[PDB]
Design a protein around this ligand. Structure first.
Ligand SMILES: [Zn+2]
Lengths: 187, 171
């Protein structure tokens, strides 16, 4: 178990997820294979909260659980769920999320231009640019909506593109350490 | 009723006596004098000496005599800080706020002095659990970013499409 995988896992769990998930991942780092009741006592959480956290973790599939059943001294069955860290799936899901965000950047860039530039405050609904000609009245000499018949201001769509552009720089700056850590974890 | 009731009385009496600042240890007869237990049985005495004042974590055994245990409990900010550091290092977990509140009178001063070092976990029943803020690696994201992450659904999305996407984007 190279320390690079552990460091990358700690960085992503601390940055993207809360302290409870970081504590769970640290527990799983200290011991490779851990029973479901083992991380139930030494953290002092409610059962429901830990179960929800484990449900989310199994949703993102950072670790893997194997089913084991056995017998007890008194004769009753014992159903212990054994959880173990799987870095092979962890790196794959991390890379999947990474490229998903990467393509989300370009889709957001395209959608910023695709947003309608016509808005009617009377009805408070976006109006597509193409149908603005349909709304326009040739005999009036000026453009207005057919429903409310009010002037349309196109300056309300100016700031979200600039806001997104500003966030692009911050996203690109903060995402670099993850790519830096990825290179050493390839082998 | 016998052999099981007076233990609560004596432990409460010695706890309240320590609350008055009596750090010095006291002999058993010293407590028995003012607790109106002069008719206590000898077997009760030896059972007390052998089990009651040695098994509980609140009684200290020093120079043969018995006293409080203020070192184990929290009485200052530094004790809370080092206890929390030990909990974080050994992974023993947190501690209920009520234990510190009853151990440390006016514990809010230490809490507000620590500030961001102390972390609170809000239970449904208003109880708070205290954790240490491990500052090994800290990173935060914008609320808009967090909303963006929450918008994408992944729990209802299987393992065939996850690896199909990788080759779709050509990475
Ligand atoms: Zn209109």
């Amino acid at each position: 178990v190279p320390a690079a995988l552990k460091r990358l896992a700690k960085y992503v769990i601390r940055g993207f997820y809360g302290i409870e998930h970081a504590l769970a991942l640290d527990i799983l780092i200290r011991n490779s294979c851990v029973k479901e009741e083992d991380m139930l006592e030494l953290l002092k959480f409610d059962r429901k909260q830990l179960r929800s956290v484990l449900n989310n973790l199994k949703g993102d599939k950072f670790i893997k659980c194997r089913m084991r059943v056995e017998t007890a001294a008194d004769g009753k069955t014992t159903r212990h769920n054994y959880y173990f860290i799987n870095y092979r799936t962890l790196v794959n899901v991390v890379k999947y999320k990474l490229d998903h965000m990467r393509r989300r950047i370009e889709t957001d860039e395209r959608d910023s231009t695709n947003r309608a530039s016509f808005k009617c405050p009377v009805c408070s609904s976006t109006f597509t640019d193409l149908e603005a000609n349909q709304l326009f009245d040739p005999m009036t000499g000026t453009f207005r909506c057919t429903f409310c018949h009010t002037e349309v201001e196109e300056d309300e769509s100016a700031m979200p593109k600039k806001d997104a552009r500003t966030l692009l720089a911050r996203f690109n700056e903060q995402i670099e350490p993850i790519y830096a850590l990825l290179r050493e974890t390839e082998d | 009723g016998y052999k099981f009731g007076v233990l609560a009385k004596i432990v409460n009496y010695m706890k309240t006596r320590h609350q008055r600042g009596d750090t010095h240890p006291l002999t058993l007869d010293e407590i028995l004098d003012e607790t109106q237990h002069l008719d206590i049985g000898l077997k009760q005495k030896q059972w007390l000496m052998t089990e009651a004042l040695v098994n509980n974590p609140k009684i200290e055994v020093i120079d043969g005599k018995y006293a409080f245990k203020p070192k184990y409990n929290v009485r200052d900010k530094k004790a809370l800080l080092r206890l929390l550091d030990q909990h974080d290092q050994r992974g023993l977990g947190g501690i209920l706020l009520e234990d510190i509140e009853e151990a440390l009178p006016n514990s809010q001063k230490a809490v507000k002095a620590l500030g961001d070092q102390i972390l609170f976990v809000n239970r449904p029943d208003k109880k708070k659990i205290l954790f240490f803020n491990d500052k090994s690696c800290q990173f935060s994201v914008d609320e808009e970013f967090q909303k963006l992450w929450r918008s994408v659904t992944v729990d209802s999305m299987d393992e065939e499409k996850i690896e199909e996407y990788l080759k779709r984007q050509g990475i």
